[PDB]
Amino acid sequence: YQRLRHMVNDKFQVRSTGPVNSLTMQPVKGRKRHGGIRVGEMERDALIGHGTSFLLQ
């Protein structure tokens, strides 16, 4: 057996309330910077899909 060099849990992150960009006032990008997880157009579409308006809000 061979052990592959990669440590897959390198992008492991958690954010409650971290820093925000001045213009958008939205969670700033950066795992190590206590950054936010992006909810993109597809996730927006999925939340519209369930008809789950408060989850989208």
Binding site: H6, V8, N9, D10, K11, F12, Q13, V14, R15, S16, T17, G18, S22, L23, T24, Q26, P27, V28, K29, G35, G36, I37, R38, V39, G40, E41, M42, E43, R44, D45, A46, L47, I48, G49, H50, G51, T52, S53, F54, L55, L56, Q57
Partner: protein, 1523 residues
Amino acid sequence: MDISKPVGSEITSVDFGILTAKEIRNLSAKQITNPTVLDNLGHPVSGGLYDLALGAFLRNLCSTCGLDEKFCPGHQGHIELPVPCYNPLFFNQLYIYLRASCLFCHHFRLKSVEVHRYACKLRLLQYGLIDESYKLDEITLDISSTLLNELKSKRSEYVDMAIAKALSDGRTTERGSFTATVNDERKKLVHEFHKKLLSRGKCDNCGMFSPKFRKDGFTKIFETALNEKQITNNRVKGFIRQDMISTYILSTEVKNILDTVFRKEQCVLQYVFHSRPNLSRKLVKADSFFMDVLVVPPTRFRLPSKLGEEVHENSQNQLLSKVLTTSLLIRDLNDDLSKLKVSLEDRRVIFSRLMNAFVTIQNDVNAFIDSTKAQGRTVPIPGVKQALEKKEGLFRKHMMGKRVNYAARSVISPDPNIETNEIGVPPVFAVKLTYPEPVTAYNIAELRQAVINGPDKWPGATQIQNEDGSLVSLIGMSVEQRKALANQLLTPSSNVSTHTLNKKVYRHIKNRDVVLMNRQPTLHKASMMGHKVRVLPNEKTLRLHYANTGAYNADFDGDEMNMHFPQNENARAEALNLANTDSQYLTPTSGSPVRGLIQDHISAGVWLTSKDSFFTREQYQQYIYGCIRPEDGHTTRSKIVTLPPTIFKPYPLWTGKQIITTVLLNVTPPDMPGINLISKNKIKNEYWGKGSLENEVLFKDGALLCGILDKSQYGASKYGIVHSLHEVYGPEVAAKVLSVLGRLFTNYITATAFTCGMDDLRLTAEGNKWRTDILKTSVDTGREAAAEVTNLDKDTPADDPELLKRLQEILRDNNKSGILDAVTSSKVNAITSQVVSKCVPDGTMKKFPCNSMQAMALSGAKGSNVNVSQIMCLLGQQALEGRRVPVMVSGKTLPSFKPYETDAMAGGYVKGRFYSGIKPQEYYFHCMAGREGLIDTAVKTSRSGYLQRCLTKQLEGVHVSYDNSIRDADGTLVQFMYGGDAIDITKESHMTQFEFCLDNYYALLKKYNPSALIEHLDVESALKYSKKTLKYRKKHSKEPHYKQSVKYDPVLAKYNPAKYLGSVSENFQDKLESFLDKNSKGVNEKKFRALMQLKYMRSLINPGEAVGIIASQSVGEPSTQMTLNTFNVTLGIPRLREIVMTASAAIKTPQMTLPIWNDVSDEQADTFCKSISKVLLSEVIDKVIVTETTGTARSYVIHMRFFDNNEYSEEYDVSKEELQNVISNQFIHLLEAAIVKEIKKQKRTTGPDIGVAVPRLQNSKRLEEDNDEEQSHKKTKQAVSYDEPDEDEIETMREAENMNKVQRDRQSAIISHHRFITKYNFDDESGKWCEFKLELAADTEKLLMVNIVEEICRKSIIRQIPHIDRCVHPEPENGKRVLVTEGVNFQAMWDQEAFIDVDGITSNDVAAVLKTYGVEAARNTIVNEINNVFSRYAISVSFRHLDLIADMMTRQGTYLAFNRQGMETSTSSFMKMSYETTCQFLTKAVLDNEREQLDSPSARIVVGKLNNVGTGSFDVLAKVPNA
């Protein structure tokens, strides 16, 4: 968001307009005049971009609101432009109005009566009345002014009357009615108006010509001088003026021209610029297109970017400083201009100084707004247009999608010990993710502990919010302070201003919380479900159960998942009751399951439920409690009930099947009876020995009495045990059964393991003998097939010289090699099938159930009988791109094989298996075929990302209304009923499973409780009507669809399905009645009818359901499975793109399906095929001999040697007479034109230019990245949207909207019609040749006549029916005798009534069908064609989705596609702005003076309003008792 902080005011609508200079000057906090931003020392300079009046900056307080950097919102300022500038966004429009106006009378050059006609039509369109706008054109009486003014009066009279009449009724409000069709009619007119405006040259009012205005890329206009004809026109029309009383043009001159024109033509422009009536009564002024000032955004939005230590200057301040420098310079130029003047004459310099001053400030203004409109500087600084469209745009990157708080990301790890509806949360996330829990009397105990525990001990609390609004962090505090604060949580509020409020505790995520689990790409809503939090100690990864693997399309290969923690109870309720996992058992795509156990559990079940599996009392009870724990709420009886043993004497023993009976007996409700189901298995009875019935799955009163349980029962498979349980007991019970079975099989696999080894791969000595004997016949097959394709009798030897010459002919042709490959492959594959059928399983040493390799393939746990046969028998023929192994120019498939070898092995046929090993030749051939697949995965530009993105943006608003109809976001009706029956796809499964429903009558009667409904519905109205429709339907059964009765329409059209029992689809009615007739079986046939009627009632789609998104997701998500290439017509994603994305009128493969009669024979139909198929001269010619002889004149003797007369007449249906006409009329005229062109081309360019350069013949690390290197980047990136169209889609978007006497007379007549021929003799008797002599001049010299003739022959058409290339006769499709055409022309086929049934002539071309047969026919073509794309890849998509998509494409009565063009006719400008060309759609919105009603999902997201779909489709009001 704080529930303690409610909001009383709300934005209902957004109005688009232009800021006036007077307006900006008043609201401005400070006038910006200085280009410097900082004084010396470091303080902001007064009158600069960092002035403190624009807000708090550099630890200084704001000089307007007095607040610091935190609380100061920032304030707007202004720059005073020394000269007016053209606003870049509205330059194109002001340009249109400048070119359209007269420079003398200062009216538009179009006649006033024609202008008034547009003003009238546009006024009537402000209100929703299109019919009246067209009826205005009917009002009709070089024409006198007294007559034309009466026409304007009569037209105005009709306009005022039509508005008042419609205003009296509920046809239009005072604010005016506005629909997409109304918008379409407005957009058409405003376009036609500007087109007519620009077309006029000479002014129709005063006959004087105006000088034409030209433009460049940048905002700058020039005036082209008039011609002498137009200058003399000004002179003669100069006297009539008295009785009534290229050069650059400055911005002021243009503004002054438009100022008077906008005053004089105010009446039409009032309706040209207002979408709805102008109730504000504002004047339409020209200065809206001009900028006399520039607003300076607050310092807050222009802060200098800080990256580590370096503080970088803001790019907007840089662009603004440039505008300030130029403004100070023009102020000096105007000051020097003011000084001096008596001395002038040379005024060419003062205008030159002015032109520079104007073009410089304009450029600085342009550079600030839109950089791609400014001059090149020696990458430029981005403008405000560029800021809104940086990449995807501000709307897409920061409005439609956003980075969120209270969310986590981690690699997922499998876990069978957690519930199927749960998520294993690492304690790392549990101590950081908190919920704002308000402290009350019922939860004071729970939260006091959390407060004491603090932010590092779970379940704790990170913070506490007091009723005054302040926050108290528990992070730095010790156990002593936390204990004190906990005893202060329920203290009464002293302040009367906050007595209403109560404290909040920001408590750690507990095991009772909801979380949103997401696995990207989120192709369908099942990839974003609600999971129950289960904090697992000593964990560093997110734990997920195997039942969730399908829906997320997540494999535990190092995948990543996003966890979202919603922060309010409304969001909680939604994630627990709507988006929760258990409510996502069935996908809305086909209504089939996406939840079930995957591998070990399937193999465990086949062993556990086997007859041989027996268990003692101790063993049996252990397996029960092992998976069912009453303390975890798994039971329904509060005591574990147990069945008696199946064996009493000698020893008490329980069967394996009894464990399955006991699990159901403890998880299903006691009040309801047991499940009754007769299903089947994947494992055939033959495997279980003689006379076994172990394939028949039998459940009688919730007891497994016969058959084992496969992937077909507790996997994600329709009509299995779990699905049957789901229909009878609900989704919560089915979820419990899945988790219970999941535990049982995990525990069973721990006590009784499952393994795979070499013993499972071996054949017996008998079985291996069969293998060698069948494969011994395969050696002959190679040469046999080679002798068949080559056409050689008695089967010639492998080394035959004639055969080897014949195989060479095959080698050089791609088609000939294809015939050889397909024949040899079919023959060797027949030998493969024989080996496999004999050896597996009757020849395997170890046999099922013990042969685990065999077991896994049969159970559906993993693998198939094909994989099993490659392992134990042979790999077979290695197929490469539909053919065999590639062959070299030498005729060798490898250097080891003989040239033109007639052997199966040489062609790639592998006799070897993976157990015994594969030979080096076979190894290399396997390497070829193995790689071939991975190459296809590398070269596959087709993506479902953009296709789904286009559908979802146009269908987002489309949902189910409370009146059961399918309505868009703006209330416009799309469908009158969902799929014409209003059924939810996630319910339409057992609705036709009548026998199932009958066997479970009392179980379902208890489920669909009618006792609490009988008082709310009607039991006869619809049932009586259903009989009346059935009566008239049976009367016209044999009659055609056009002759059918229209007296009574369907029962669903007249009676609400949720209020009237019996208002069911005629499809359901016919199916239900047919069951009661064909099956005569204490349930009556009348009481069963009522139950099924009630089942349909309870299967209705809920009002609010986003059927739009669901439809696009149901077309998008499965279109990912058809990314692979063809194994003629366009298939997969390219064909789907031709329909949905581009709605092409020019299809790649246009076809026509012609249904042939019964009286027309197979020979007659083939003769008919030839009669329509396009025939070329090339197709009938065998040889052309050109005898170039130069004498006296270049003589060219062209002899056309055709095939025999009877040969081409039987192959193309072409006569000798037909050939004569084409050569004598077309071919010679085409040949003469080609020779003349070749003589000119010879004398034009003598040769290529020597020394002069000619044109050349023809991310880097990313393209060299392997799949493990490329998927790792996708593994970490959280996608902005739906992939990218940068492939073929971008290039598709690159399209903007001795001779006889009779023979002598014939020759002489042809000589008079052709300039170069001398002789013309054609075979009239036999019809085999055509000879003609061509005479050329002595100066024409050398020419390549053969090559010239050749090219014209394949260009000459003998016979062709317009737009049709070839008509073929395929195999009868589903019993229907049809002919497939490679072209479309209905009117031509209409004349072939003797052969074709003109009422059944199908066509794939939607646009062609629309043009001839109408919108409803095109609509039916869309639903059929999209279905053909999915049915080919064996993908089932509900017609309810396709019908909705088709209805949306045909909403305008035309064929609209899901793209920028189709979208143009949509109410929401915000939806349009968030799709593409944000500034362009915004400009169109402002110019229309549009009101965004905020009714589209996109618009609501933009303004932070709750979406109107689902939970937002109503309002919640509280009932209060006191008066």
